[PDB]
Enzyme design. Structure first.
Site, mmCIF file in Angstrom:
data_model
loop_
_atom_site.group_PDB
_atom_site.id
_atom_site.type_symbol
_atom_site.label_atom_id
_atom_site.label_comp_id
_atom_site.label_asym_id
_atom_site.label_seq_id
_atom_site.Cartn_x
_atom_site.Cartn_y
_atom_site.Cartn_z
ATOM 1 N N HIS C 48 0.813 -1.218 0.000
ATOM 2 C CA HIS C 48 0.000 0.000 0.000
ATOM 3 C C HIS C 48 0.848 1.270 0.000
ATOM 4 O O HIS C 48 0.359 2.349 -0.336
ATOM 5 C CB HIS C 48 -1.063 0.010 1.120
ATOM 6 C CG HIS C 48 -0.523 0.277 2.495
ATOM 7 N ND1 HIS C 48 -0.530 -0.677 3.492
ATOM 8 C CD2 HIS C 48 -0.010 1.399 3.054
ATOM 9 C CE1 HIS C 48 -0.021 -0.159 4.597
ATOM 10 N NE2 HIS C 48 0.303 1.098 4.357
ATOM 11 N N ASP C 79 -0.201 -7.521 1.377
ATOM 12 C CA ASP C 79 0.287 -6.151 1.554
ATOM 13 C C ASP C 79 1.802 -6.050 1.708
ATOM 14 O O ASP C 79 2.300 -5.340 2.581
ATOM 15 C CB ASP C 79 -0.403 -5.480 2.745
ATOM 16 C CG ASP C 79 -0.470 -3.972 2.605
ATOM 17 O OD1 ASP C 79 0.126 -3.425 1.647
ATOM 18 O OD2 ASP C 79 -1.118 -3.335 3.469
ATOM 19 N N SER C 157 3.998 2.335 8.286
ATOM 20 C CA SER C 157 3.748 1.274 7.304
ATOM 21 C C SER C 157 5.048 0.829 6.644
ATOM 22 O O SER C 157 5.792 1.657 6.145
ATOM 23 C CB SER C 157 2.803 1.776 6.202
ATOM 24 O OG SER C 157 1.473 1.950 6.668
#
Lengths: 466, 466, 466, 463
Positions: C48, C79, C157
Site C-alpha cells: 500500500h 500487503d 507502514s
C-alpha cells in the site's frame, strides 16, 4: 503463561426493562466482556458486563464450547459480579488466580482480557499511574481506584490486571476517554475486591460499602476557621447537611467541624494521610469499613470537642442511580401511569443528556434532595393513556404526585394502597406546579381494563404491588 | 520514590488582556499544570502554564496547603518559566532533581505530573522515540525536542521526564494529537533547559535563543548547483532573503550558497551530521549558541569562497507571535482606536481560524513581511468608536495606517507622537486600500473624552504612550 | 543501535487511474512510508506504500540523498512489496535484518519507522498483544496477524517490528482506530513474510496465498448435528456453497461436513488447535500452504466418511478487490462506455460509502455472487457520452450488460469482440432491469471518433482490447 | 406610501453582564422605521437596544441623519425616534393607522431587508390573529400573523392594508427547516395602546397582566367536585403573585367565572370577534396600568365579586434590564450581582435554559417574588486574592442571608455590608454553604483587586 488460562470470555444477552413503558422489555442486545477464576467454583467479572442478563455464557482458552453461566451475586456500586458455571467440563484443570497487595506507582502491570480487534485473548502492558478515590462510572460511587497506562479497550471489562509476579492486583473496568487524553484507564483494586468477597462470605449476600450521610465544606479560609472558634492548630471540614435517614443525624449537627475519623485527622481540604507521603480523600476510611461497623467521629461544636461512635450504613438516594434485581414498579388507574423517578427512568425519558433536558423540578431533586424517610420515593404520573375517562388531563407528563385526598404521598406502594382503599366519591391528586387531578372514584376504576387492552398492557401494576 | 516529592502541582488564575478592547481584561479563568524543584529555591514549569497570571499557587505531595508562588522569569519561545515560593514551610526537606544528558532512542522514560483523570500525582512510562528540531507550538520557535511514547495528558505540562537513573532528561510540554495518531508527545530537552538556566544566570534575565535572519532554499537539483558555479564536491543551501534588522544583512547576500556554519558542512537539504549516524536541521547549531555569540559562516559567492564572523541575535517578527509582560499598546483620537497587529490580536479578532479568516492584506504581512527597521510595527485602525466627529468613517476596521500628514508611520509610538504634536488644521491619515481619513485637528481632540465615557474606557491610551 | 540503519524512509508519488474515466489518470499525490533491508539488494515495504507508483525514492539514515527505487514485486493481498535500488552508494555498508520466529503473547516488541510528528526515524515500544487470523484491510484477505500495543502511526507502514534480540518479527502495517480504542496495531508476521519470499524465490513471481473456495456454516447446535447423522464424538463445519471455479467443486458437495484438513480436526465453530493452548480459524492451515500444493480433506456425507486430495488455488472474486499492474479495461462504441465492476470502480463512482450508496443490484453481486467461470466479469455501461447517435439512452448509468444479440456476455473482451465482429443490421444489448439498447450497427461505429474528440479521449479502448 | 418608510442604522454597545463594569464590543445593525406624525418615527425596540448611535435615511436622499430614541416599550417591542434636522422632514407625509384587519385581507410589508440596500415591498394576506409571544419582549400580546415574506431588516417597518393604512409593525418571524411564510406584525391596537399610554403619562407604563396562574376545567369530575353547576364554566386559580393586589382578595382554588362581566370558558377563552375566541389575557392587556377590573369567582358554592386594580407583571428573574446598566457591587473581590435572563444567556450561552445550574433555572421558571423589589442575588465570580483564599471556585451561587438577616435584593445586601459593624461578614449561600470574611480586612482589600482587573468602580452608580 498458565495465568492466561484462568481468564475467560463473557458473552451476555441483555434484556432491559423499558422504564418508559414499565410493563414491557426493550429489545434484546448482546455484549461481550471478560472474567477470571478466583477459586471455589467462582468467576469474577464486572456487574456492568451482565446487567439485565437473560443469558450469560463463558468460554475458556483452548475450548471451543460456550458454557452457560449464572450470576451468583452482584455489587452494583463497586461494579463487581460473581458467576457460577454448572458444567464440570468447564472447571477441569482450573487454576484460580491469587490476589496481590495494592501496588505502588510505577509498578509494572499487564491487563489480560478479550477486547475489540480480535476474538482471542489479548495482553497489554504498562505501569500503575495513580491511586486515589475514584468515581466508579457505572456504579455511581466513590471508591479506591488504580489508574494505569496499559491500554484498556471495550471488552477488557472484568478481566484481571497482574503485577510482575503474576498476582492479580485488580479488575480492569473503565476508562477516561476524550479527544484530549491517552492511556487513562482504571482498575478495581484488590482491597475493594476483597471487601466484596469478604462481605459476600460473611453475610451470604452483598451489603455494600458504607458512606456517611453528610455533605461537607472545606475550611481553607483562616477567617472562616477563626469565626467558628477553631484554634490555630485545628483543621477539618464543616458539616453542611446531614441525611435524615442516616444514624449520624441523631448525633451530628450542621456546622459541626469534623476533626477526625477513627483517630485519623482530617485536613481543611478533606484529605487524610495515605501510604507513602500521599494524601487521599477521607471517604476512603469509611468505604473500607463494612455496613454495620461503627466509627469514632470527633467534632468541634461551639468550641467543645465531642466524640460519637456512629454505626455506618449504605447511602440511599431519593432518586436511585440503579434499580437492580427487579422490574421498575408501576400501577395504572384510569389510564394514569404512576411510577417512580430513578436515574434509568430519566435516561429513558430524556436520553443520555437527561442531566440537561429533564424537567428542572425533577433534576433539582436528582442533584439536591435528600430522602426524609427510608423507602421514600419520588412518584410521578409518567403519562396518561388517553381515554374518555381522563378528558382534560391528557397532556400530563412526568409531574410529581404530592398528595392523595389530602394525605401526603410517601412512595408508590403508599399511593397504590390509597387508591385501592379509597371509598370517597372522588380521587383528588395534588400534583406539582399547583395542579389538581380529580376523577370519579367508581368510573375511574371501571375504565382501566379497556385501556390496558388498547395498549397491549398485560397488567395494571407490577407484581410487587399485587 | 523520593523523586516524586520534587514534583508539585501548579494552580494558575489567568487574566488575559482583551486584544480587541485593549483598555480592559478578559474574564478570569483557571488552569492547572505541573512543576519541579531544580535547586536554589527555584521551580521550573512551562511558560504556557502561567501566561497572564494574576495568581499562581503550588502544592507539594503530602501537604494539603496551596502556597502562593511568583513567576521569577519566563522564556516565551522555549516555553519555560521559573517560579519562586516565599513560604519556608513549602521548602522544608526539599530535594531538587538533577538534570541528565540527552538520551538515546529507545531509552526508557517516565513522565511525572498532574494530568486529568485525578487530583494526585501520576506516572506514565514509555521510551524515547525521536530527537530532532521541533516546533514549539506555544513558543512559536524551532528548537531541539525529544519525542516520547509515554502518555502525556493535559496537566502534565511543566513536569519532568526521567531516565531510568532518576535524572531529569527534560520537561513534558506538548503533544501531537489527531484522530489518526497515538502517543506522540514531546519533551523540552535538558540541553534547552540548561541553555535557559545558564542564560538567566549570566545575564540576570532571559535573552532568548539566537536564530540567523535568513530564509533559504534547498539545492538538491544538480542543474541548479552547476548553474551557480558549485563544484561537484560542494553542497549547501541558497540564501533567498535576509532580515534587514539582522547583522548578517551587512555581510551576506541573496543567492549566496551557505557551505558551513562553525566549520560544520551543510548538506543540500539543509541538514548537518548529528550524534550517532543521524542528520539534523542546521538551525540546531545556531540555537545552541547564546545571543551575543558570534559564528563563522562560509559562503560561495560568484565561485569565490568567503568567510564572515557574524554576531547572533534573536528573531524579531513584524507581527509578534507573543506580547509578554505588558498590556497591548493603544491610543485613541476622536473615537479611532489605533493599535498594532500581533498574533494574539489576530486570534482575538478572527478566532482560532485567524490564519484563514483574517484580511488577506494582514495575513500577507504575517506570513511574508520582514521588518525594515527595529521597533517597526504594523499599525491599524482597530475600530471606530462611533460619534458625530467621525461621520463617514464608521465602517473602518483593521486597516493599516501607512502615513500621517505625508510622513510614513513606523510604529504606534511614532504615530501617537505625530497626532500629539500636530499643529496643522487637518490630520490626514493615509490608510491601506488607497483610502484617506481626514479630521479637523482641533475638534478631533476635543471629541475624545465623551466617547471614552460612553464605552467605559478609563484612558485614551496605554501607559507606555503616556 | 546498528539495527536502525537498516530502516529507510520511503517517498512515493502515486498516479492512480480514474476508474470513472478509465482513459485518463487522477491527480498526482505523494505519501511517505518505511522499508527495511532484508538481504540480497532487496528492501521490504507494504504494497500500500507504493500503489500506482510513478516514482519511489528511499533515504537511509545519515545520508541526505533520496535514491530512486523500483518495485521488484508486489503481493497485493498480503500487503507486501519488495524494492530494488540501483545506486551502489545507497547499499554501501548495508547490514540486513534477520527474521525471527513467531513471538509469544507479552513478548517485548519495538516498532521502527518514519511516522508523522517528525522527519527522522522513530522507535516505539510495547508488547505482543494477540495473535490470530486477521483481516488485512488494504489486501482484503484473511491471514495470520500479530496485534501489538506499541504505537503505530501513519508513516510506520512497511517498517520492521523487532523482538528484544534485534530480530525482525514482522512488518508494521495497519491499525484499528476508533474514538473508543487505544493501541490496537497490527504486524505482518514473519511466517507470512517468509511465505511471500519463498514464493517469489521459487516461482520468480508472486503466486498468492491459497484459500479454499467454500462458504461454511458452524455446527454448534446438537439437533443440527444429529439430524445430519453426526455421531456424538464428531465435530466440524457444514459446506454452504462451493466456488464453481475451484477444483474442490469437483469432489466436495454442499451439506458435506468438513471433519478435518491435513489430519487436523475442525471444531463445530471452525477452529483448530493453535500453538500453546489456543484455537485459531482453520483458514490458517490453508493459507500457510502454497498455490499448487494439495491438501487432504475429510468429510462426512450421508454418514459416510470420505477423503479427497484437493489442489489449492487463490481466490478469484467476480468483483475484484484490486486491479494491479494494469489500467482498468474499457471500450467505447457510439458513446457507450463499457467497463467492468471492481471494488476500486465502485469506490470511485460512489465514494468511501460505496457499500451503502451503490446500486443494490451491483452490491448484491459484490457481497454474494460467485464467478461461474474463470475470467468471468461483471460488465456495465458506465455512462453514455451523449451524442445524437445515442438519443433516448442518455440516462443509462452502471447497468449490467447481460447479452449481445442473443449471446450471453461473459466478460469485457468477449463483448468487445462481439461488437467488433457484428455484421447484423442492429446491435442489441440486453441490460439489467429488463431493458434493451438497440443501435444501427453501421452508424454506431461511425459516430465514435467525434465523441472521443469532444471528451478529449485519446482512444476508443484500453490496449488489452487492441 | 414608500417615502414615509425610512432605513434605520444602529450602533449598539451592550453591557457585559458577565463583567458588569464594562461594555461589550460595538456592533451594527440595520432596520426600518416609519413616519407616524408630529416629528415621530416608529420602529421596534429591538432595532435600537443599547444604542450608542442611531441614524436614519429617507428614500432618495443620500444623507444619513442622526436620530434619538424618545421612548421605548421593551415588552411590546416598540420605540419612537425623533430627528432634529429639518432637511430630513422635507415634504414628509406621515402614515395613518388602520383598524385591525380580518383573515385573508391583503397586506403589504415595506422596509429594508437583506438582499439589497434600497426599499423592498412584499405582499401576502393576513393569516391569523391571536395572542402571540413577543420574542424579544417576552410578553403575550395580540399579534397578526401574515404570509407576506418578512426578512431580517424588515423589523420596525409598516404593514399596510390595500387602502394604504398601516395595520401594524413587522417585527418577528417563526423560522425552522419545516416552516414557510410565518411572519408576525404588531397590531395597531397594541401600537395605539403604546401611543395613548405615552401621551397620557409622558412615559411608558406597560401592559397590565394579572398575577395569577390558572388551570383549565375541561374535566366534568373536576368541575363537579368543586361544586360547579352543569351550566357554569371557568378556570381554577393555581397560584397568586404575593406582590399582586389580587393576593389580598382572591384565593387558590377559586374558580374564575368572568372578567368585566365577560364569561370565561373552561379553556380560559372569551369571545373575540368574527366567530373566534381568545385567551382572557387579551381583555386584561387592552386596559392600562392603574385601571381596575371586576372579577367574579366561585368559592365554596358562593359567588363573590371583586374590583381589582391592574398592574404590569414583574418577574423575580427579569427578561430585560432596561434604562440602566446591570447592577453590581464588589467587596474583597467578591462580585455580587442579580440574576436576569440576559445574565443567564451571557453566562451559559443561547442554551442557558438547559446548561445553567438547576437551582437557578428552577427559580427562573417557577419562583414568584415574595416581596416588592425582591431580586435573586448571586456571587457571580471571585476575583482571586489573598483575602478570598478558599473561596475561589464559587460561581453563580445564590446569597440567602447576611449576618443572620435575609437578603432581599442587591441594594439591601450592599447596605448591609456597608453598615456592617460586626467582626465578621457571614454570608449564607445556596447548597448550605457559608462564606466568612473579616470585616475590616475585607473592605481594605477591594481597591487593589479592581486595579488588577481594570475595574473603574466597586459598584454600579444605582447602588
Amino acid at each position: 503463561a498458565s495465568f492466561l488460562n484462568a481468564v475467560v470470555k463473557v458473552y451476555c444477552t441483555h434484556t432491559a426493562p423499558d422504564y418508559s413503558l414499565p410493563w414491557q422489555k426493550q429489545r434484546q442486545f448482546t455484549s461481550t466482556g471478560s472474567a477470571f477464576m478466583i477459586g471455589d467454583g467462582k468467576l469474577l467479572t464486572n456487574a456492568h458486563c451482565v446487567e439485565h442478563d437473560t443469558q450469560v455464557k463463558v468460554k475458556r482458552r483452548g475450548d471451543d464450547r460456550k458454557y452457560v453461566a449464572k450470576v451468583l451475586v452482584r455489587g452494583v456500586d463497586c461494579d463487581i459480579a460473581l458467576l457460577s458455571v454448572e458444567s464440570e467440563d468447564f472447571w477441569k484443570g482450573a487454576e484460580p488466580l491469587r490476589l496481590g497487595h495494592l501496588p505502588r506507582l510505577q509498578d509494572s502491570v499487564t491487563v489480560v482480557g478479550y477486547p475489540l480487534g480480535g476474538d482471542t485473548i489479548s495482553v497489554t502492558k504498562g505501569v500503575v499511574s495513580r491511586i486515589e478515590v475514584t468515581s466508579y462510572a457505572h456504579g455511581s460511587s466513590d471508591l479506591l481506584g488504580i489508574q494505569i497506562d496499559a491500554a484498556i479497550n471495550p471488552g477488557n471489562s472484568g478481566g484481571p490486571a497482574f503485577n510482575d509476579q503474576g498476582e492479580c492486583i485488580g479488575v480492569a473496568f473503565q476508562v477516561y476517554r476524550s479527544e484530549e487524553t491517552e492511556n487513562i484507564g482504571y482498575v478495581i483494586p484488590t482491597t475493594v475486591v476483597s471487601h466484596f468477597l469478604t462481605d459476600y462470605e460473611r453475610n451470604g449476600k452483598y451489603t455494600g460499602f458504607p458512606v456517611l450521610g453528610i455533605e461537607w465544606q472545606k475550611m481553607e479560609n483562616p477567617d472562616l476557621r477563626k469565626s467558628m472558634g477553631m484554634e490555630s492548630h485545628q483543621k477539618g471540614v464543616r458539616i453542611r447537611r446531614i441525611e435524615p435517614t442516616a444514624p449520624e443525624s441523631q448525633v451530628l449537627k450542621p456546622s459541626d467541624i469534623i476533626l477526625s475519623f477513627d483517630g485519623v485527622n482530617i485536613a481543611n481540604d478533606g484529605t487524610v494521610p495515605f501510604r507513602h507521603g500521599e494524601r487521599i480523600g477521607f471517604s476512603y476510611l469509611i468505604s473500607q469499613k463494612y455496613t454495620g461497623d461503627s466509627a469514632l467521629v470527633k467534632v468541634l461544636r461551639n468550641k467543645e470537642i465531642l466524640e460519637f461512635n456512629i454505626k455506618l450504613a449504605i447511602h440511599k438516594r431519593l432518586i436511585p442511580a440503579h434499580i437492580s434485581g427487579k422490574p421498575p414498579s408501576y400501577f395504572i388507574v384510569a389510564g394514569f401511569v404512576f411510577t417512580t423517578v430513578s436515574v434509568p427512568y430519566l435516561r429513558s425519558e430524556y436520553g443520555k443528556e437527561y442531566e440537561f433536558d429533564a424537567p428542572v423540578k425533577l433534576l433539582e431533586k436528582h442533584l439536591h434532595a435528600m430522602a426524609q424517610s427510608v423507602d421514600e420515593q419520588l412518584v410521578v404520573v409518567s403519562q396518561v393513556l388517553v381515554s374518555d375517562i381522563n378528558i382534560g388531563y391528557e397532556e400530563i407528563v412526568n409531574t410529581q404526585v404530592v398528595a392523595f385526598n389530602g394525605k401526603p404521598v410517601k412512595n408508590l406502594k403508599g399511593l397504590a394502597g390509597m387508591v385501592e382503599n379509597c371509598e370517597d366519591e372522588y380521587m383528588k391528586f395534588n400534583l406539582d406546579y399547583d395542579q389538581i387531578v380529580v376523577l370519579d372514584t367508581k368510573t375511574a376504576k371501571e375504565a382501566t381494563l379497556d385501556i390496558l387492552t388498547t395498549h397491549c398492557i398485560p397488567s395494571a401494576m407490577s407484581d410487587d404491588l399485587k
